Structure formats: structure tokens, C-alpha cells
């Protein structure tokens, strides 16, 4: 009876949170038995429910995030967690488009005097 994260990614949030909050009820009932002695079969199943809550919330936080990557798909300003992360120094450098900008005087010596190709015989 193991829930798996790829079995969950088609089901919407009106039935993920219903499937989520009764796992949290199930986790709270197990910690009741943890302090009343309980049973060793019901103490090993704490980790099975703690990771079941972590797996449902992962699918929720990933269905939500990709729906905001696509709501802002092609907008002038995106939130700071949706624009890329890479490195602070890499976010300050010039981009692909303005590193290869050249002045009109620079791109006239490129076309009048191009670097030729030449062999020299002996």
C-alpha cells in the first residue's frame, strides 16, 4: 500500500490535500501509541508515514511551481525564485547579445581587412 510520486502527478489538489491530511491524522495516531508503549509493528510505520507526507507535499510543491513557470512564460518581469539562480557573479555579467556588440568602426576593419589564410613554401 505504498503511495508513489508518479501515481500522484495526475490527481488534482482537491484530492491531493484530502489524501494528504489523513496521512497526518495517521501520523498523529502513531505518536499516541509511541508514548503508551504501543507495538513495534506500529513504531516502524512512523517512518513510512513521515516519508508519505514528504512525498505528497513534493508533488504539490512541484505541480504548483511549474504552473508558475508557465504563467510567467514570456513576461517582462518574473519573480526572483522563477528567474535563474546560477551564481551572483554570473548574473551580473553581460549577456549573449551585448558581448558581441561592436562599434561601426570596429566592424569596418573586420570587413575590409579580414584575417586571411596563407601557406608559405620553402
Amino acid at each position: 500500500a505504498k503511495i508513489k510520486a508518479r501515481d500522484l502527478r495526475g490527481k488534482k489538489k482537491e484530492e491531493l490535500l484530502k489524501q494528504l491530511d489523513d496521512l497526518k491524522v495517521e501520523l498523529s495516531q502513531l505518536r499516541v501509541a509511541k508514548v503508551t508503549g504501543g507495538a513495534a509493528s506500529k513504531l516502524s510505520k512512523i517512518r513510512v508515514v513521515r516519508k508519505s507526507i514528504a512525498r505528497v507535499l513534493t508533488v504539490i510543491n512541484q505541480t504548483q511551481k511549474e504552473n508558475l513557470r508557465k504563467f510567467y512564460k514570456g513576461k517582462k518581469y518574473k519573480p526572483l525564485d522563477l528567474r535563474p539562480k546560477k551564481t551572483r557573479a554570473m548574473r551580473r555579467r553581460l549577456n549573449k547579445h551585448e558581448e558581441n556588440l561592436k562599434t561601426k568602426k570596429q566592424q569596418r576593419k573586420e570587413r575590409l581587412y579580414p584575417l586571411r589564410k596563407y601557406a608559405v613554401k620553402a
Partner: protein, 120 residues
């Protein structure tokens, strides 16, 4: 004239301060309420002085999170146990976490609530 300075002091005049209207939210989503009702109450106490207070004093006793106040505890017991609360007394133990003495209404009694929870 007809403007008149009836004070020896030049004060800075007030200007138009207008509210923000940003082109984008700085955070994409509001952050999830990670201290919810199931994160308030962690586990009850079943000690020999806790069962002695369920009988004579008509009150439950839980181990709550250290971040919670007496209003969140009174609402979390009211939600996920379907019982009404008179008052809540709290202390932080030398273990580190916070003990909550939640007292029920005189309608209910904690002896047939602890049967449903299963701590008895």
C-alpha cells in the same frame, strides 16, 4: 501676499506619497503555513501525574510546539478533537519543549475523550 508666513520656521511641506504597485511579486507564492493544526500538537502525556489530572481536574495535557501560543492551542484542540476548551495553561519544560494543560468545558470530560484518542 496673499501668502503669509505666520511662523519663523520653514517646515518641509508634505508631498504626495503613493502606495506601491509592483510589476511583479517578489515571491512567487505565499509561503505555506508550516505550523498548522497537526504541527501544534505533537503527542500527549501519559505519565502518572498526567492521568491523575485527567480524572480529578477535567483537563487534557499535550506536548505542543515551542512556537505556539495559548490561542493556537485552543483552536487546534477544538479542530482535530471536536471538543471545546475552557482555558489553556502552558509551560516550557527543562527538556526544551512546551507542555500545555488544556482544560475542557464542563460539558465534556477528559475521561471519555482520552478513550477516543487512545492514550488511556
Amino acid at each position: 501676499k496673499k501668502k503669509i508666513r505666520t511662523s519663523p520656521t520653514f517646515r518641509r511641506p508634505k508631498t504626495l506619497r503613493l502606495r506601491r504597485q509592483p510589476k511583479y511579486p517578489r515571491k512567487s507564492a505565499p509561503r505555506r503555513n508550516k505550523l498548522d493544526h497537526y504541527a501544534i500538537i505533537k503527542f500527549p502525556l501519559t505519565t502518572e501525574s498526567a492521568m491523575k489530572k485527567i480524572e480529578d481536574n477535567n483537563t487534557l495535557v499535550f506536548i505542543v510546539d515551542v512556537k505556539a501560543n495559548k490561542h493556537q492551542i485552543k483552536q487546534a484542540v477544538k479542530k482535530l478533537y471536536d471538543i471545546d476548551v475552557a482555558k489553556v495553561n502552558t509551560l516550557i519544560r527543562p527538556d526544551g519543549e512546551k507542555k500545555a494543560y488544556v482544560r475542557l468545558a464542563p460539558d465534556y470530560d477528559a475521561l471519555d475523550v482520552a478513550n477516543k484518542i487512545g492514550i488511556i
